[PDB]
């Protein structure tokens, strides 16, 4: 154990996987994908390896991991996986870890499959809560030009208070996911490793924190529906940002048509008026269904997670509802 | 000793009043984790934390009550009981059995912990002019304190000081076990869970209790928001507290201190003998 | 719960810090407030915990013309409060009125510690009875504080004018304040300073500075009587069950008070019970007899000698009492405190409903009576006729006290079938 | 991104000076500015980094007619900065009006900082709000940083002027400011004087001297406020996904302030909660509740006993509020900053938005609207006579400040499904 911490530098390894796979360092993982999303929004045939590397050296030496040691932020790169013809860009990522060494021994294939799915898990919920701080981003943005038209207050104050339950679920699952799912394993980890005296205990110490992992996260045989329910509530996040974005492409461009009206004159308005009382309804029952859609599939996830581990995944539970809101509608 | 023979009475003060209206529901109606975290509560909160083994303690329910000595509509009040486990080096002493008799003789004393502090919760609601339910609530509360104190120091005090002294003369660990039943035997003997009918006498007495607190508490709201309909419950509950108090003593007189607890019941002498026995 | 305690009068003022003296001396803290880590002891029902490691005491002070304050000030107990609520008469019609006129921001103090904290038991009202700046205005809050909150508890820690006869207008100040105590207060501790001052020439020389003595007598008493409260026992150690075991009629709720070490400045229990039943130990001055009595023992007590001592008072016939319900005499077991010089180790308590104190009453009852033939002796201030023009509510107050006493000899008899 | 801070006014130049005082003290540099090899934390979205040895703090000095500035440069940290921006009145409209003649150098200097950094998040303005020579300028500047740049965040440390009642003119000066700060930030950290001074004068001894003592206080709180972001957390570390969280209705984004050590001059989670629930361990002064709180803690914690701790909140009805939302209570970690001396190790922050402070607002609502019935305390002033003849714009402000009001008054409520 001396040894092989030393001359190949074992444990420093073991640090840089909690880090950079299992996003424990998160600055880098922030500031990394800020710069990717128009590429990934790109389908990934006209995605290529060089252009990763090439920005990823700007995230390392900017943040802080360019003073961890040499090795370590080596081994960092990316990789990407088998592409398809339909492909976006987002589904086909990966950062691997490479093994150097005869650490093969220590880790195994298959605890890097395991490693790649739940850095598949914390990908997902990374993308959507961006997307939802774009959400408050435009009402924060656009709110204070559209002070000369209150004919749209009841459609945007619906989306704003359709906005902050995303807020409070994406805000619960994240806390979910940080104090009992990379945590209590971490405390468990660091205690069964710094005791350990012997190689068959270290090995077998990190085989149970991952398959503990496995099974607080949900990506189990038998929590797979409840992970196809949680997608579900993915899909509204998304739509969203193209249905609030289909106001300002009406709302905020006419009253820039409106002003240059007025500079000209230092009958057209009529039908601009008009045309709003056309609009206003029809997305107007977009939203309220959308609504509707989205609180029926958030409820019917909270009553399947009843029925789940006695006390693991019930935890999640008591995270989802504080104020009993799916017991005072339901 | 701490949680079962309430060595901690802060824990028991701050916990009831925080649980018995979620404890007070029918079986099947309350959750285990609402009441864990309650639990766990009035321990961290209370100085009983000062003890290194505070995890052990649990909650469970007993749905079968005294009739398992050779629940099913109420709980908490009927079926509730702390269970505190066990390791492997102390499970040679304090083993199931020994725990099940723990816990038999707890869920006995949980009722006269409960059924004073009834009586003197509805005391407070209320700080020519029916005046009666006072001398009623009064010489029950009397009894019931009277009725503690008796078990609290007269039983399990001083064997508990008994066993102090016992266990530091013991030389292998058949001396300990030996003590420890000899402990158990007579602190369960002594106390009422004995005897052929396992005095139902004093159920019923308490039942008439918690009858007297329920209907003068429903009374006195209503009247705040007949006068002699109500009369006749509090008199026929006169009538049965005091039948079944002359049936307690007539059933300890027939057996041969422990003419004791008459003592202190009645200090003056009254009520002493108001039927003559055989 | 948790328990606030309210002190005003000067007299009163002065033995609510020596308590909170005494309490320092008795809890993990120091003279300036700071824990100490030689400490088993809640010090949460009467202090207020912050982590700004200066305890501070659950106490409202409230004063009339600060005097005796800046005494209070120069002390090193300054950093163990700071609650900002002192602020600047002779009667008890005066002092009402001028506890009338400024109710709203006193009650503003009281409503500031009503949400401080969360759980609220009861309030403990440190006064003396016909005192001038207490009397009038500790009974307009003790009025205020019942009409405002009937869920709580109202607990009163006084002592008696009494002096053998000078001022002539304290039994009109005492009978308007008994009527007060009997129907805006619970539960009423009646202590005097005639018995207490006879103690004090007993055990010291002392016969011009009393007051520095008996204060330490009083402070005594009332750190013994919230022992059980304060360090966790079973039996009583909340307010409310405690009250409740000791009234047996709701117009009968005043508390002797005795204390077994007559002079600290081995033991069986029949010794202490014998000792503490003897009128000397006693601490507040035809058949007059108790009701029921509850004593309190604190010290190194074996269990099985508490009965026996109950079983030889049993035989002694020292029940020369006789009520006329079941209810008898009660004992009680509280440990002796650690953590403080603590010298004779065994030490009593009694709480006991005793009728000779009506005849304290009556001697009040008699000299208001003999001025309203005079009608000398009222002083005829201004405010006190504007309260009152006719002064019929005095009146009322004697038939209120009239039909007390008539409920106290009634309550003496074994014939309380019929009402008094 | 890099967050740019802009301070005016004297005292909040001074604040501003003490806040770079204490992160210098926080980071890992000398009081000359050069750097110590004992150092994990970032330096790069409060200070500029040259490799001149001196990290540029990223500070925007404005003044007017500089008199502590000369005390600021007398000082040790003269050589941590001198970006040149030092430049040479009394109500809102006149210290408007002189905003507006010069602002085309005061806007080239803040266009110095924007073409400096290529990354750009935010802009903090540290302002006092009626300040004097603060007010009407910094509103000025609030209007024209929001108006040129769209994409960026506003977040403002302000202070509350309170003295209960001298300065006439400043119920406009804060109405007006308010209007700006409504529609011209997107987050505004609400601070009082009073409630500041009340628990200085709870902590030590003081009257005359205050300034000196509450300046530290603040800057504990915005020192406490940004180490979520210095020192890299995952949650909310940048101040878009912090600000994102925090506003349910974009009429509301004032942030309530507390913070565990009340005084600092063992611990377990569920204690430094219930401690941190209550009012007095709270900087900011019918049913008022909060509708969604964030709490963050700094210490030595253990992850499960956060989650025992948020269910015991949960068990003890101390949630006895009730908005319209699911959005509920937040509980955030992050670690105590090592390098320096730490007292007090684990202590803790809350950002609440609260409606009690709208009491506080429609104070100055009151107080405005008697004085628009009198109209002799205007004190007509040229310049604001000239910038609006009919004084209209105080009366549109008071309009939006009372729908401010009763949106509020709609968002203490369950039902907010109709607009208020």
């Given amino acids: 154990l001396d040894v092989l911490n030393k001359k190949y530098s074992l444990l420093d390894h073991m640090q840089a996987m909690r880090r950079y796979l299992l996003l424990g360092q998160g600055d880098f993982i922030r500031h990394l994908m800020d710069l990717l999303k128009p590429e990934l929004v790109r389908p990934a045939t006209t995605l290529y390896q060089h252009n990763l590397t090439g920005i990823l050296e700007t995230a390392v030496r900017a943040t802080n991991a360019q003073f961890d040691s040499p090795e370590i932020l080596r081994r960092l790169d990316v990789r990407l996986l088998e592409v398809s013809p339909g492909d976006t860009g987002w589904d086909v990522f990966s950062l691997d870890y490479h093994v150097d060494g005869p650490i093969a021994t220590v880790f195994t294939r298959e605890c890097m499959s395991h490693y790649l799915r739940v850095f598949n898990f914390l990908w997902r919920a990374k993308r959507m809560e961006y997307i939802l701080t774009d959400i408050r981003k435009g009402h924060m943005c656009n709110a204070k030009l559209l002070r000369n038209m209150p004919e749209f207050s009841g459609v945007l104050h619906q989306c704003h208070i359709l906005a902050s339950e995303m807020v409070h679920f994406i805000h619960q699952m994240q806390y979910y996911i940080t104090f009992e799912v990379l945590e209590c394993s971490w405390d468990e980890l660091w205690n069964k490793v710094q005791q350990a005296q012997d190689l068959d205990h270290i090995i077998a110490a990190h085989e149970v924190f991952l398959d503990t992992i496995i099974s607080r996260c949900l990506l189990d045989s038998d929590s797979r529906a409840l992970l196809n329910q949680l997608r579900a509530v993915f899909d509204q996040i998304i739509e969203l940002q193209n249905a609030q974005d289909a106001i300002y492409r009406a709302a905020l461009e006419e009253l820039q048509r409106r002003l240059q009206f007025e500079e000209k004159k230092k009958e057209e308005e009529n039908k601009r008026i008009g045309e709003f009382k056309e609009s206003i309804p029809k997305m107007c029952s977009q939203l309220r269904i959308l609504t509707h859609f989205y609180q029926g599939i958030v409820q019917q996830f909270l009553v399947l997670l009843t029925t789940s581990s006695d006390e693991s995944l019930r935890f999640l539970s008591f995270r989802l509802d504080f104020n009993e809101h799916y017991k005072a509608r339901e | 000793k701490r949680y079962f023979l309430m060595d901690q009475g802060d824990f028991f003060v701050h916990f009831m009043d925080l649980a018995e209206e979620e404890l007070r529901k029918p079986v099947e109606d309350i959750t285990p984790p609402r009441l864990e975290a309650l639990l766990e509560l009035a321990l961290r909160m209370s100085t009983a934390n000062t003890d290194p083994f505070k995890d052990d303690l649990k909650i469970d329910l007993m749905p079968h009550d005294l009739i398992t000595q050779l629940e099913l509509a109420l709980s908490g009040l009927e079926a509730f009981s702390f269970d505190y486990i066990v390791k492997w080096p102390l499970s040679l002493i304090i083993n199931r059995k020994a725990l099940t008799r723990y816990q038999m003789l707890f869920r006995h004393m949980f009722y006269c912990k409960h059924v004073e502090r009834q009586l003197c919760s509805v005391w407070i609601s209320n700080k020519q002019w029916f005046a009666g339910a006072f001398t009623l609530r009064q010489r029950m509360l009397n009894f019931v304190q009277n009725i503690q104190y008796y078990m609290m120091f007269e039983v399990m005090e001083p064997t508990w000081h008994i066993l102090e002294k016992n266990l530091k003369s013991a030389s292998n660990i058949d001396d300990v076990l030996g003590h420890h039943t000899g402990f158990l035997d007579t602190c369960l003997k002594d106390c009422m869970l004995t005897n052929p009918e396992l005095l139902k006498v004093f159920s019923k007495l308490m039942s008439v209790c918690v009858m007297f607190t329920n209907c003068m508490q429903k009374f006195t709201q209503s009247m705040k928001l007949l006068v002699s309909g109500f009369e006749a419950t509090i008199n026929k509950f006169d009538k049965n507290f005091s039948a079944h108090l002359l049936d307690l003593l007539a059933r300890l007189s027939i057996y041969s201190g422990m003419a004791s607890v008459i003592s202190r019941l009645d200090f003056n002498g009254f009520y002493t003998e108001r039927l003559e026995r055989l | ?420």
Wanted: aromatic residues 10%; proline residues 5%; contains cysteine.
């Fill in chain 3, 1 to 420: 719960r948790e328990i606030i305690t309210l002190q005003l009068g000067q007299c009163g003022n002065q033995i609510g810090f020596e308590f909170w003296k005494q309490l320092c001396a008795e809890h993990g803290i120091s003279p300036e407030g700071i824990v100490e880590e030689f400490a088993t002891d809640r010090k949460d029902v009467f202090f207020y915990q912050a982590d700004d490691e200066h305890y501070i005491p659950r106490a409202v002070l409230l004063d009339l013309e600060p005097r005796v304050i800046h005494s209070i000030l120069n002390s090193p107990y300054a950093k163990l409060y700071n609650p900002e609520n002192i602020y600047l008469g002779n009667n008890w019609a005066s002092g009402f009125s001028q506890g009338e006129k400024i109710h709203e921001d006193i009650f503003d103090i009281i409503d500031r510690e009503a949400d401080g904290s969360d759980s609220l038991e009861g309030f403990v009202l440190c006064h003396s009875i016909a005192g001038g700046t207490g009397s009038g205005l500790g009974s307009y809050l003790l009025e205020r504080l019942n009409d405002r909150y009937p869920k709580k508890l109202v607990q009163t820690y006084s002592v008696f004018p009494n002096q053998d006869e000078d001022v002539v207008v304290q039994p009109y100040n005492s009978l308007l304040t008994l009527k007060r105590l009997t129907q805006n207060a619970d539960c009423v501790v009646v202590l005097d300073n005639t018995a207490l001052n006879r103690i004090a020439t007993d055990r010291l020389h002392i016969q011009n500075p009393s007051f520095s003595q008996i204060n330490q007598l009083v402070s005594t008493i009332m750190s013994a009587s919230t022992t059980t409260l304060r360090y966790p026992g079973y039996m009583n150690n909340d307010l409310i069950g405690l009250i409740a075991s000791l009234i047996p009629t709701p117009r009968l709720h005043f508390l002797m008070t005795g204390y077994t070490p007559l002079t600290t400045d081995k033991t069986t229990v029949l010794d202490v019970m014998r000792r503490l039943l003897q009128p000397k130990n006693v601490m507040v001055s035809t058949n007059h007899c108790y009701i029921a009595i509850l004593n309190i023992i604190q010290g190194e007590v074996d269990p099985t000698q508490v009965h026996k001592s109950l079983q030889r008072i049993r035989e002694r016939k020292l029940a020369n009492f006789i009520p006329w319900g079941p209810a008898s005499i009660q004992v009680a077991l509280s440990r002796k405190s650690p953590y403080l010089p603590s010298a004779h180790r065994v030490s009593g308590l009694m709480m006991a409903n005793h009728t000779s104190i009506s005849s304290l009453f009556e001697r009040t009852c008699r000299q208001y009576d003999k001025l309203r033939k005079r009608e000398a002796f009222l002083e005829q201030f201004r405010k006190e006729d504007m309260f009152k023009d006719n002064f019929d509510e005095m009146d009322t107050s004697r038939e209120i006290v009239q039909q007390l006493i008539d409920e106290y000899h009634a309550a003496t008899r074994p014939d309380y079938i019929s009402w008094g």
